[PDB]
Design an enzyme around this catalytic site. Structure first.
Site, PDB file in Angstrom:
ATOM      1  N   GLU A 100      37.469  42.235  43.665  1.00  0.00           N
ATOM      2  CA  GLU A 100      38.325  41.193  43.098  1.00  0.00           C
ATOM      3  C   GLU A 100      37.506  40.063  42.486  1.00  0.00           C
ATOM      4  OE1 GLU A 100      41.910  41.147  42.873  1.00  0.00           O
ATOM      5  OE2 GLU A 100      42.644  41.287  44.935  1.00  0.00           O
ATOM      6  N   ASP A 101      36.571  40.446  41.616  1.00  0.00           N
ATOM      7  CA  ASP A 101      35.735  39.567  40.803  1.00  0.00           C
ATOM      8  C   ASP A 101      34.611  38.902  41.582  1.00  0.00           C
ATOM      9  OD1 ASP A 101      37.248  39.760  38.226  1.00  0.00           O
ATOM     10  OD2 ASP A 101      38.812  38.815  39.439  1.00  0.00           O
ATOM     11  N   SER A 102      34.316  39.349  42.795  1.00  0.00           N
ATOM     12  CA  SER A 102      33.108  38.879  43.447  1.00  0.00           C
ATOM     13  C   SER A 102      31.896  39.619  42.897  1.00  0.00           C
ATOM     14  CB  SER A 102      33.190  39.071  44.956  1.00  0.00           C
ATOM     15  OG  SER A 102      34.177  38.245  45.526  1.00  0.00           O
ATOM     16  N   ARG A 159      40.657  45.395  32.607  1.00  0.00           N
ATOM     17  CA  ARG A 159      40.208  44.364  31.683  1.00  0.00           C
ATOM     18  C   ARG A 159      39.665  44.914  30.376  1.00  0.00           C
ATOM     19  NH1 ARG A 159      40.290  40.827  36.129  1.00  0.00           N
ATOM     20  NH2 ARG A 159      38.639  41.439  37.590  1.00  0.00           N
TER      21      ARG A 159
END
Ligand code: MG
Ligand code: ZN
Ligand code: ZN
Ligand code: ZN
Lengths: 205, 151, 80, 235, 46, 303, 109, 147, 144, 574
Positions: D63-65, D226
């Site tokens: 989750e975008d870490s 994305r």
DNA sequence: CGCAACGGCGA
DNA sequence: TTCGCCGTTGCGTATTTGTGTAG
RNA sequence: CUACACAAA
């Protein structure tokens, strides 16, 4: 048409209210020609308590639904006969419901005759068998004793209940007066039908 | 096979003899209320909110809450200021908290309004805390138990 | 000098210990608060006795854990 | 990326040592992209050519870490200097710069240091922390300036410039040594934001057969929704 | 907006059907500009 | 809809002629992302992406205003000691959610008898192992429950646009799962025929179903057998019907009497744990739960 | 001529109420504590154990929260739950007093 | 070794100037408060703050929390004690240390009650009173179990 | 014909610095030089006769209104038009609208500086059709 | 005398008249000077009798040091009456309903009896009432026309003879009105129109106008009221001098700007998102709260939040010292602010004063009833919140896990806990506050713990589960075949799958190092602790991919029987 | 920018 | 005489965070 | 404190 549906369903309304007719059911042609000529059709019914209910079906273009003088005269003459007169039901076109002259006539005739109930309704209220409509849950009037014991168990006042207008179509077909209680069996998609009790308030118009 | 029309004329469809008058479904809540009553209008509110919600909608009891709140008075009230005025005319503090506090305050002053402190907004606007949740039921001390046990 | 009925709500800072003897503690607290001071157009000499009281309700609008109790009591007052 | 390309740390100014700037970050090391674009013919590139492994490594990059190399942080990767400023005016002849005298005072700050002051100012190169007083202004009513920040700073530059009335003021420059911390936001040129969630030592980081190891470990789940195929092609 | 150009707007209901806004500049960028509005009302008046 | 001719009269972009007919002129992208879009294709994709960003930007404000208005219209609805929902003292619901259940304590289970025909209802649920009228009335009760469910939800179908009848409902207790777990953990196996045990199990299930509306009151009134209000009797209708479906004789032959007692107490405990709490701000819960899908309704407006 | 008096002079405060406790066999509320009620009981008991120190717990706990939780679970809590049903406008507060030590404790865990 | 070959290579990365050391904030139970509302000041810049907004109160109310609304909104905020006369409904003047027990309204018949409030609500009521709207607080009646 | 496309760059112009500062200077000058000096000349011609004052008397009245209370407020007014950006600024007891919009040069990096100097601002609801349409990529944008 | 505990049951709203202001006011404002030295000028608008905003003096009225002083109002006896700015429309409605010579209701009063009381007066003022003949005094009613310039000036256009209706004239006109007229018009006794003209206005408490711009308006009004002669009298058609007319207009306009302007008004602090109600009352600024960027931590439980140690030493837990906890609280006290876990303050019971630990070397004694404020330790409950708070789970309680690494300043959380807050780790910030009160801690543990929000209140379904790496990892682990063959691992790797599970590991004693275990076997070994029955097709099996691929028969039907993963892959559906 | 009282004047 | 109309006013337009700049 | 600007989710 509105007149034909009214003619076929007003007697269904009368029998659903547990009333017996006092005259003979005339043919539809005679009914419509009487509405056109006289200006209204009068149906008299007898309740279980021997009270008299007069149903006036006013024509759309009649003189009684746009001139307040004739409406006053008709109401006074019909409310002066030697009859018990439990209720007077006046049926008009929907636009007549917005005429302040006729509405004010109804208001003064009600005030002058407090014992008698006078109600004015639109055409669509009796153009269909209202209790048989699928969207309308089964309304039923509960006696004041059953309502009192329900409220006593629930520690409620009648003003704490959800309200329903006396002019509500199912309540009109029931005949509930303001201050009465109506039990409703509404279908539920959470509990598969539920029971609610609503307090009947003053009728709109 | 059925007919899906544009525009609601429930009365006109009941007058028509070629369609079933007892199973007329109209997307409009006002026509349903005028033709059928407040219970059918509440069911219509449930159906319309459910249609708006979509595939991933909330539980049905939340739609029930919406529809029962708006139909509790016997007429379909709104979630705007007018609905709050109809349902809670005396709750001056909640209506002030919603919007137009000066107008609500002026009307309350001239109307000599009495505001019972209930709900959430009214106790909050008086610095108090709502009597809900853990503070819905009030706790009293067990005098008999403490007398006979906590010597 | 005559008996007058007063109404008050006390504050109970230790509700557990207070409830071990409610009557004695209530009389002590009433005598402490209303000893020889004016209260409601009366000088109240001493507490005759409590005639009606309430359960020790726990305070709800603060996290103090204290109780209050309402007590309606009789006492002799010095009106002049 | 247009949004993130303009908050990227770098050489924010080429004449930074002569500027007393506030909330300005000067990143020491910059690289030309290995796959550059025409925008770098006219503007300086800000960032580094980090080795990125697109892999799942313990679930710390979800989750975008992003998992960062602690060694890459230590060597200067995205390290730089954060700058703050403290400009304090002298108002009029009433106020002046000097260490307040505790005996007289009027409103001495409680818990403040009030030491580390020479000629009214903390000297250049002195570490200041929390309650320390920087720039002692006295009117004697105490109007000193307290540091306040929870991050200690080193006084980088002090001067007393003449305002636009031939009056002196403060404007000391504070210096923060900002390495890449856990929780610092990183992004690629394709717009893939990431927060540094875990820093691993060089022995804990995955390595290829020929010894190559990443600087950042980027979750493959950042891509499919994305559609940032430009980053993939650039790699 | 560009000056010396007409901005016809079907804006909307207030008894106005359409409006035309023209801002006129004597010939520079700093000269005083006077705007004219040419309304077409529901009543028929231009 | 496709890319509208916004550039000029009949033109979508400066790259395409006036009144162009090719699909590419109106936003048809023949390339993939891996292949790399051309300049006008990228312009059209940027139009689409900007539209999505604008939608996300403005839906927040619209849905936030709607949510605040709903919260203020609904926040006064609080569950009282009768589990009704009221504003101050005026009733909003006779029972919360018309079943008095917490939304966090619901499981979707299937009602087997709903789609069953008359013959398959007899074949699966009419027990012929004891020539007794008790099982005749049990099957009659099952058939009548099925018919009532059918009538109610067929009416619900009638006054809706496309709300189809389903045999799956959200209930506080999954009775079938409880029965299955007790079956699995049962030390014994296939029970031998025991008419007394079967009759006692049927009688105790019938008594449990009769006393089911007392979960909405307490064990004191259940012990005293005081009258149950009609709305409370309706609230237990779905769970009564499910218990009759799942604890029928045909499905509880291998259940011992003490095993069935354990089943019934577990069902009652789970039902008690599923009821909405006194003082719950259910209006705020409803406002939140209906405001969350409003954002997705706005976001999906362009579809 | 009319000169309006102050609002306070025309203000009658309220009628004091008498607590009407519903008899035990006439109580219609749940015999199981709600999660709100159990949480409030434990919170009140723990705060009182923070101001007092006396407990009937044989096992010794170093936290008032643990003592209060065990007192609720072991049915030794010195509190009562009062559920106000109705406020009669003749001056009567109708309540149901429930004993938590005889009530059903919710999951709470 | 991983069973799958891993895609690894040089990808140009940028450090966005959002520093956790700048963004992080923690405040204790004391600090600068507003002169008017008595509430904490706003945010890190003012050396005290962080707001529990309307929606946070809605969420804590839906959870039925209270006692956390109490702690946060009163103990860690401008929560104070109000005094109402219970005989006129108007605010009273009470001071335990220096003994004052009075209300500017009915004097001898004063029954001052200790009402938990917030300074924001006291200011709000003062502002409604400044607009010539009289706010009278009825106060809950005292209840007595029968003798 | 369709109405005027409010978003098209066919009928749009970008004014920066030159036009903006020129208009601000015109507005400030008309208030801080012409009007002070008009008041000074009115005072001189009222409380002094004509046909007898010398050439230097006119010059003294001229410099009286410009060497006193002047060049410290018009300069201040233009500095205020540059800094800040609030709509109205005080110019000699009368406010005038600040027609120049400025933003601080935030030196996040060189690219941010260049982009800030290349940004076209459209400084003037959120749920109208206009609010959605004026944030879109218009078909006249490509290349500009 | 121990003001007893009370709660507000109802609130009544009324129009405040001169008598209310005179009774409630603690002083009368006479002099316009602000200060007398270091103390406020007695008789001014800053008089300490009306509260204290500084700590240099008390209130006189209540003798409270600013914080405990709520403020008190004072009266300003105005030499000329003013209209109430809030009720100008009410004054207008009452004016064109009664005769302006005897206070008689020249209106069909019997006509307005059926109406609801609030609408009665509005309807009556909607009537003609222009040129109408009176009854008691038999006079012609002038036409009341509201002034088009200001908001408070009234005219009586009597057949073209316009005259100003000064508030004194309006006061007399309204005073002639009987209570019977007010009652029959649907208003109350406390809403008599005489209240609408203010002879003596109320100076607000200093608590609501602290700091020495609203005070400028009050000072202007006071000093301009001093200009009016004390005994100024106006009757209908007086034609008073222009100077007095300007002074009266300015005074009334000053009062209107003080109450209802747009300096910001008293009534302009109420509305809007940033007003009194929505910003100060419906929300709040709070102490003892932290905010930081959130990052992921796979080793944290779903009900655990990683708290940096620096924040754990800032936020404190108030532990009241008693006999049962003195031994546990002793290490915190001894550590102080020097070592962790420690404390920061101690509240002394017998002193009623807090003392910082750094300065508490001379105390070294903890008494029963003392309150120790200790650092947050692992296991404490904390409230986690992400904005916007749209769901019931947007505030949840997590168990504190203190990250003792000083280099970490993020709020670490499990990636599966993000579904409660709709959070991700691309820059999101979250509020975290640790309950310090015993009541709030109890309720955070028992009521607001995130276990209660596992099931959505909205959709009645689960909220959390495997996301991203864990969903594809479950699929990879439970898939039947890998490109290397069967998806099996030896005993060492099957054991290593449970290394970080942080529960009691299963038993592998019956497995030899050479033995091969399927992924489904180890999954069943985990799932046996909570046996469930599950049978559903996985997300992996799609009909859009069925014409292609070669779906393994054991992968496309997930079945769990009493915790045994019989077959099928575990993925998003499961 | 939109929404809704409103209250005064045309019907 | 009872209603439409129409300017004319108010009200309202997600939340929580930071940094500046000036007055 | 009142603008305004730049940003974050
Ligand atoms: Mg995010
Ligand atoms: Zn009083
Ligand atoms: Zn005071
Ligand atoms: Zn008269």
């Amino acid at each position: 048409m509105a007149m034909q549906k009214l003619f076929t369903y007003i007697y269904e309304f009368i029998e659903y209210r547990k009333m017996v007719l006092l005259e003979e059911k005339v043919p539809y042609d005679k009914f419509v020609q009487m509405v056109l000529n006289t200006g209204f059709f009068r149906i008299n019914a007898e309740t279980l308590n021997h009270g008299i209910v007069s149903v006036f079906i006013f024509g759309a273009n009649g003189k009684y639904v746009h001139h307040g003088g004739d409406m006053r005269t008709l109401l006074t003459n019909t409310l002066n006969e030697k009859k018990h007169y439990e209720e007077l039901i006046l049926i008009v076109d929907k636009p007549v419901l917005s005429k302040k002259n006729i509405l004010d006539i109804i208001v003064e005739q009600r005030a002058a005759n407090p014992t008698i109930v006078i109600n004015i309704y639109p055409y669509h209220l009796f153009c269909i068998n209202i209790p048989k409509v699928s969207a309308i849950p089964k309304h039923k009037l509960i006696t004041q004793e059953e309502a009192q014991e329900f409220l006593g168990r629930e520690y409620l006042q009648p003003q704490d209940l959800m309200q329903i207008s006396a002019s509500d179509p199912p309540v009109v077909w029931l005949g509930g007066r303001p201050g009465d209680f109506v039990q409703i069996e509404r279908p539920s998609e959470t509990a598969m039908h539920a029971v609610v009790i609503r307090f009947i308030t003053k009728s709109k118009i | 096979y059925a007919i899906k029309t544009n525009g609601t004329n429930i009365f006109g469809a009941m007058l028509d003899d070629n369609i079933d008058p007892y199973t007329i479904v109209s997307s409009s809540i006002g026509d349903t209320m005028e033709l059928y009553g407040i219970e059918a209008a509440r069911q219509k509110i449930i159906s319309e909110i459910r249609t708006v919600m979509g595939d991933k909608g909330p539980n049905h009891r939340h739609l029930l809450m919406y529809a029962d709140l708006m139909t509790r008075t016997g007429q379909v009230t709104s979630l705007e200021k007018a609905g709050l005025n109809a349902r809670e005319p005396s709750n001056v503090l909640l209506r002030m908290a919603l919007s137009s506090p000066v107008q609500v305050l002026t009307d309350a002053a001239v109307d000599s309004a009495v505001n019972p402190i209930y709900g959430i907004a009214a106790p909050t606007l008086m610095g108090s805390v709502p009597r809900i949740g853990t503070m819905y039921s009030d706790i009293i001390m067990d005098e008999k138990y403490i007398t006979e046990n906590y010597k | 000098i005559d008996q007058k009925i007063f109404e008050t709500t006390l504050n109970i800072d230790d509700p557990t210990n207070f409830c071990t003897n409610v009557e004695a503690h209530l009389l002590k607290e009433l005598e402490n608060i209303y000893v020889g001071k004016c209260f409601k157009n009366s000088f109240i000499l001493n507490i005759t006795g409590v005639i009606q009281r309430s359960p020790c309700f726990i305070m709800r609008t603060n996290n103090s854990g204290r109780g209050y109790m309402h007590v309606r009591f009789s006492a002799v007052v010095s009106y002049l | 990326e247009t949004n993130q390309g303009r908050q990227t740390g770098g050489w924010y100014c080429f004449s930074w040592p002569y500027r007393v700037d506030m909330n300005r970050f000067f990143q020491f090391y910059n690289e030309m992209p290995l796959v550059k674009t025409i925008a770098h013919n006219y503007v300086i590139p800000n960032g580094l050519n980090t080795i990125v492994a697109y892999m799942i490594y313990g679930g710390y990059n979800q989750e975008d870490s992003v998992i960062v190399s602690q060694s890459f942080i230590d060597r200067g990767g995205f390290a730089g200097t954060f700058y703050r400023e403290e400009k304090v005016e002298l108002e009029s002849d009433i106020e002046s710069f000097g260490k307040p005298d505790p005996l007289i005072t009027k409103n001495l700050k409680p818990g403040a240091n009030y030491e580390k002051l020479v000629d009214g100012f903390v000297p250049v190169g002195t570490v200041v922390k929390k309650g320390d007083i920087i720039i002692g202004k006295v009117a004697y009513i105490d109007r000193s300036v307290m540091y306040g920040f929870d991050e200690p700073a080193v006084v980088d530059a002090v001067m007393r410039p003449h305002g636009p009335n031939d009056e002196i003021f403060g404007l000391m420059r504070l210096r923060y040594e900002r390495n890449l911390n856990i929780g610092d936001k990183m992004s690629s040129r394709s717009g893939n934001k990431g927060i540094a969630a875990l820093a691993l030592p060089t022995s804990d980081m995955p390595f290829t057969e020929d010894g190559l190891q990443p600087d950042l470990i980027v979750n493959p789940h950042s891509h499919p929704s994305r559609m940032t195929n430009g980053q993939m092609i650039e790699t | 907006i560009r000056f010396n150009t007409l901005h016809i707007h079907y804006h909307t209901g207030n008894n106005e059907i359409i409006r035309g806004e023209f801002i006129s500049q004597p010939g520079g960028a700093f000269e005083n500009s006077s705007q004219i509005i040419i309304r077409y009302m529901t009543t028929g008046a231009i | 809809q496709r890319i509208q001719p916004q550039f000029s009269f009949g033109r979508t972009l400066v790259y395409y002629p006036r009144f162009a007919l090719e699909a590419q002129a109106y936003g048809f992208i023949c390339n993939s992302y891996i292949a790399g879009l051309t300049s006008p294709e990228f312009i059209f994709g940027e139009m689409n992406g900007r539209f999505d960003l604008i939608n996300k930007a403005l839906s927040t404000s619209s849905t936030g205003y709607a949510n605040r208005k709903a919260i203020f219209g609904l926040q006064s609805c609080i569950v009282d000691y009768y589990r009704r929902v009221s504003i101050d003292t005026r009733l909003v619901q006779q029972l919360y959610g018309e079943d008095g259940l917490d939304a966090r304590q619901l499981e979707t289970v299937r009602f087997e008898t709903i789609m069953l025909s008359d013959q398959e209802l007899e074949d699966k649920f009419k027990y012929t192992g004891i020539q007794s009228p008790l099982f005749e009335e049990e099957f009659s009760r099952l058939k009548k429950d099925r018919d009532k469910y059918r009538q109610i939800f067929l009416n619900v179908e009638n006054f809706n646009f496309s709300q189809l009848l389903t045999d799956v409902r959200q209930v506080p207790v999954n009775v079938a799962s409880i029965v299955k777990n007790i079956l699995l953990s049962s030390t014994s196996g296939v029970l031998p025929f025991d008419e007394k045990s079967i009759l006692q199990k049927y009688a105790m299930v019938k008594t449990f179903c009769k006393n089911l509306p007392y979960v909405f009151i307490n064990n004191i009134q259940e012990r005293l057998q005081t009258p149950i209000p009609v709305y409370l009797k309706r609230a237990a209708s779905l769970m009564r019907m499910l218990i009759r479906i799942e604890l029928a004789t045909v499905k509880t032959l291998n259940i011992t009497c003490e095993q069935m007692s354990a089943i019934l107490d577990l069902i009652r405990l789970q039902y008690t744990q599923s009821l909405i709490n006194y003082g719950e701000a259910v209006g705020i819960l409803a406002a939140q739960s209906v405001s969350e899908p409003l954002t997705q309704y706005m976001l999906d407006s362009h579809h | 001529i009319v000169e309006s008096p102050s609002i306070c002079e025309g203000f009658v405060q309220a009628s004091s109420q008498t607590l009407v406790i519903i008899p035990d066999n006439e109580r219609i509320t749940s015999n199981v504590l709600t999660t709100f009620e159990a949480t409030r009981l434990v919170a009140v008991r723990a705060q009182q154990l923070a101001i007092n120190g006396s407990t009937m717990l044989k096992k010794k706990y170093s936290s008032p929260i643990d003592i209060a939780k065990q007192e609720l679970f072991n049915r030794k809590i010195p509190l009562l739950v009062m559920r106000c049903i109705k406020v009669t406008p003749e001056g009567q507060k109708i309540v149901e007093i429930w004993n938590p030590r005889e009530m059903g404790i919710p999951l709470l865990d | 070794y991983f069973d799958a070959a891993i895609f690894i290579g040089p990808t140009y990365h940028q450090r966005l100037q959002k520093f956790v050391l700048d963004d992080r904030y923690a405040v204790a139970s004391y600090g600068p408060t507003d002169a008017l509302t008595g509430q904490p000041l706003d945010g890190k810049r003012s050396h005290g703050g962080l707001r529990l907004g309307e929606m946070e109160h809605w969420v804590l109310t839906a959870q039925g929390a209270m006692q956390t609304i109490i702690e946060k909104s009163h103990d860690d905020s401008d929560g104070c004690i109000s005094y109402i006369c219970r005989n006129c409904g108007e605010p009273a003047i009470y001071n335990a240390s220096h003994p004052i027990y009075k209300c500017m309204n009915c004097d001898v018949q004063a029954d001052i009650g200790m009402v938990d409030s917030r300074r924001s609500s006291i200011v709000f009521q003062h502002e409604m009173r400044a607009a010539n709207v009289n706010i009278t607080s009825v106060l809950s009646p005292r209840v007595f179990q029968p003798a | 014909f369709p109405p005027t496309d409010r978003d098209s760059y066919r009928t749009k112009r970008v004014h920066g610095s030159g036009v903006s500062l020129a208009k601000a200077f015109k507005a400030i000058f008309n208030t801080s030089v012409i009007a002070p000096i008009i008041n000074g000349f009115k005072e001189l011609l009222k409380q002094t006769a004509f046909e007898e004052l010398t050439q230097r008397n006119i010059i003294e009245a001229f410099s009286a209104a410009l060497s006193k209370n002047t060049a410290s407020d018009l300069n201040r007014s233009m500095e205020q038009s540059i800094i800040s950006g609030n709509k109205t600024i005080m110019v000699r007891q009368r406010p005038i609208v600040n027609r120049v919009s400025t933003q601080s040069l935030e030196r996040k990096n060189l690219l941010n500086t260049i982009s800030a100097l290349r940004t076209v601002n459209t400084h003037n609801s959120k749920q109208t059709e206009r609010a959605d349409m004026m944030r879109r990529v218009h078909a006249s944008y490509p290349g500009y | 005398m121990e003001a007893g505990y009370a709660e507000i049951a109802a609130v009544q709203f009324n129009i405040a008249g001169d008598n209310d202001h005179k009774r409630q006011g603690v002083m009368e404002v006479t002099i316009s000077n602000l200060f007398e030295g270091t103390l406020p000028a007695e008789g001014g608008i800053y008089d300490a009798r009306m509260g204290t905003t500084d700590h240099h003096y008390k209130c006189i009225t209540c003798s409270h040091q600013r914080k405990q002083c709520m403020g008190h109002p004072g009266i300003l006896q105005m030499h000329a009456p003013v209209l109430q700015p809030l009720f100008i429309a009410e004054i207008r409605r009452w004016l064109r309903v009664i005769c302006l010579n005897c206070g008689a209701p020249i209106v069909d009063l019997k006509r307005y009896e059926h109406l609801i009381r609030p609408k009665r007066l509005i309807e009556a003022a909607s009537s003609q009432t222009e040129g109408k003949q009176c009854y008691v005094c038999k006079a012609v009613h002038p036409k009341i026309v509201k002034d088009s310039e200001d908001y408070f000036t009234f005219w009586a256009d009597q057949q073209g003879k316009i005259d100003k209706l000064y508030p004194q004239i309006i006061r007399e006109i309204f005073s002639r009105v009987t209570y019977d007229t007010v009652v029959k018009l649907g208003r109350s006794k406390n809403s008599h129109p005489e209240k609408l003209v203010l002879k003596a206005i109320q100076i607000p408490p200093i608590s609501i106008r602290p700091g020495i711009d609203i005070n400028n308006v009050i000072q202007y009004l006071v000093r301009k009221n001093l200009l009016i002669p004390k005994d100024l009298q106006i009757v209908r058609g007086q034609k008073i001098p222009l100077n007095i007319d300007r002074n009266l207009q300015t005074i009334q306009q000053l009062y209107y700007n003080f109450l209802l302007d747009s300096a910001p008004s008293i009534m302009r602090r109420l509305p809007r998102k940033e007003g009194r109600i929505r910003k100060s009352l419906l929300g709040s600024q709070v102490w003892s709260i932290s905010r930081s960027t959130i990052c992921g931590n796979s080793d944290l439980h779903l009900d655990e939040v990683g708290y940096p140690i620096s924040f754990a030493r800032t936020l404190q837990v108030a532990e009241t010292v008693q006999h049962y906890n003195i031994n546990r609280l002793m290490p915190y006290f001894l550590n102080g602010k020097r070592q962790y876990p420690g404390c920061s303050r101690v509240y002394k019971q017998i002193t009623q004063s807090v003392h910082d630990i750094e300065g508490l070397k001379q105390d070294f004694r903890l008494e029963v009833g003392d309150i120790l404020y200790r650092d947050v330790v692992t296991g404490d409950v904390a409230f986690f919140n992400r904005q916007p708070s749209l769901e019931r789970s947007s505030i949840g309680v997590h168990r504190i896990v203190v990250l003792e690494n000083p280099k970490i300043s993020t709020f670490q959380m499990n990636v599966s806990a993000c579904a409660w807050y709709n959070a991700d780790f691309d820059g999101d910030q979250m509020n975290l506050w640790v309950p310090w009160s015993v009541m709030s801690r109890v309720e955070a543990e028992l009521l607001c713990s995130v276990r209660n929000w596992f099931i959505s209140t909205k959709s009645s379904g689960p909220v959390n589960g495997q996301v991203q790496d864990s969903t594809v990892g479950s699929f990879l682990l439970t898939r039947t075949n890998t490109p290397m063959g069967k998806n099996v691992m030896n005993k060492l790797h099957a054991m290593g799958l449970f290394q970080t599970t942080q529960t009691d590991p299963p038993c592998f004693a019956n497995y030899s190092p050479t033995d091969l275990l399927d992924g489904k076997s180890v999954v069943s070994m985990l799932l046996r602790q909570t046996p469930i029955n599950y049978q559903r097709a996985p997300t992996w099996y799609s009909e859009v991919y069925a014409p292609y691929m070669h779906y393994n028969k054991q992968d496309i039907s997930t079945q769990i029987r009493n915790g045994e993963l019989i077959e099928g892959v575990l993925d998003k559906k499961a």
